[PDB]
Design a protein around this ligand. Structure first.
Ligand SMILES: [Cl-]
Length: 393
């Protein structure tokens, strides 16, 4: 119900462009795997679209053909929007080609995703605010993650994360500025070991995008561990993939927006040990840091953490980001079952870019986002299905 069409670009996706010397076995393999992918999408009622600029000629064993008759011969269950053949199609890098497809097929923006590799296609999808699916089977990418190394991975992403009705296992709201989402419920019997980076970034990407949560998001960030001596264990493992998801949302990932200045249950323990970094890394390739604090006023920011139990961590993140004027979304991989989230607001003013020390009495507990009333009416099974996924019959 969420995904209704997949747009495919050509360059280094359907046909290798950058390098004419791809292994000859590879191109035939990719052609075979792409037929499986398109038949899979057809099997689910999902439309296959090719979006191209030129009806270029394609060297074949039999001779040269046009791109149109190449695609219709090799992948007949398809819709070819070729700008050279139809002046009504706008230039793709402006993102307006997305709006065209939306109207032509009567589809919403986030009922579509965009498979591509070239920077031109990355622009076309992100300028169109459509989720980018970076295909890297012909041309590798080393700068960031959230990649799809072969067509099968796109089918795995769709089947596992994009077809179910329930994108969030738990979600709740309070006032107008408190918004909590969690992918799956969690329960344990003790006081990456669950899943894998690619599993969690793909889970996040799908649920965030198809629920509509990514609309207007400017920033993605993670929280900090309790240990001042090692506060970025999660961010460090997830950095590569979060960089890629931010590129795909056309947002910016701030790895070190939160500082744990002291090692850290009353929520004061979190508030009194963290603050916003006035100079986080602006250029994750260089390590170049902001010259002035990031402008968070009026900006939507997605705060990602692994576990949400009673909300002490997320509420501290929200408190600091709210004090700096941001609009905050609190997202979690896992929500502990039968534990309520206590929502808090500070009585005294917060200095968000430096350390604060609040009393117990400086906390106003204003409400609760209970568990049983916010569950969407299994993680074990989802990881197994993803880890063991293969083409169906
Ligand atoms: Cl093209």
């Amino acid at each position: 119900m969420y995904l209704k069409a997949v747009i495919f670009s050509i360059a280094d996706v359907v046909l290798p462009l950058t390098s004419n010397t791809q292994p000859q076995e590879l191109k035939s393999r990719i052609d075979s795997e792409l037929r499986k992918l398109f038949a899979f999408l057809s099997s689910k009622g999902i439309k296959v679209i090719f979006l191209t600029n030129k009806n270029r000629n394609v060297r074949t064993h039999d001779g040269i053909v046009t791109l149109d008759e190449y695609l219709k011969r090799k992948f007949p269950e398809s819709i070819h929007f070729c700008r050279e053949l139809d002046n009504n199609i706008p230039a793709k890098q402006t993102g307006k080609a997305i709006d065209f497809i939306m109207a032509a097929l009567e589809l919403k923006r986030n009922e579509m995703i965009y498979v591509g590799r070239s920077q031109e296609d990355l622009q076309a999808a992100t300028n169109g605010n459509t989720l980018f699916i970076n295909a890297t089977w012909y041309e590798p990418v080393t700068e960031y993650g959230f990649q799809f190394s072969e067509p099968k991975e796109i089918a795995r992403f769709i089947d596992v994360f994009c077809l179910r009705e329930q994108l969030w296992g738990w979600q709740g709201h309070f006032n107008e500025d408190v918004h909590y989402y969690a992918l799956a419920p969690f329960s344990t019997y003790v006081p990456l070991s669950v899943g894998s980076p690619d599993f969690w970034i793909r889970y996040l990407g799908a649920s965030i995008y198809f629920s509509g949560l990514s609309e207007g998001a400017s920033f993605i960030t993670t929280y900090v561990g309790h240990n001042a001596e090692d506060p970025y264990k999660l961010a460090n493992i997830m950095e590569h993939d979060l960089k890629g998801l931010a590129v795909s949302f056309k947002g910016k990932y701030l790895k070190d927006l939160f500082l744990r200045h002291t090692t850290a249950v009353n929520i004061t323990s979190q508030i009194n040990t963290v603050n916003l970094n006035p100079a986080p890394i602006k250029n994750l390739i260089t390590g170049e840091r902001y010259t002035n604090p990031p402008k968070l006023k009026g900006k939507k920011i997605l705060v990602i953490d692994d576990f949400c139990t009673e909300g002490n961590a997320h509420e501290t993140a929200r408190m600091y980001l709210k004090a700096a004027g941001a609009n905050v979304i609190n997202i979690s991989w896992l929500k502990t079952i039968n534990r309520d989230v206590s929502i808090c607001e500070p009585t005294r003013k917060i200095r968000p870019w430096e350390a604060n020390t609040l009393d117990v009495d400086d906390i106003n507990y204003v409400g609760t986002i209970g568990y049983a009333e916010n569950v969407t009416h299994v993680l074990s099974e989802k990881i197994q299905q993803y880890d063991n996924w293969d083409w169906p019959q």
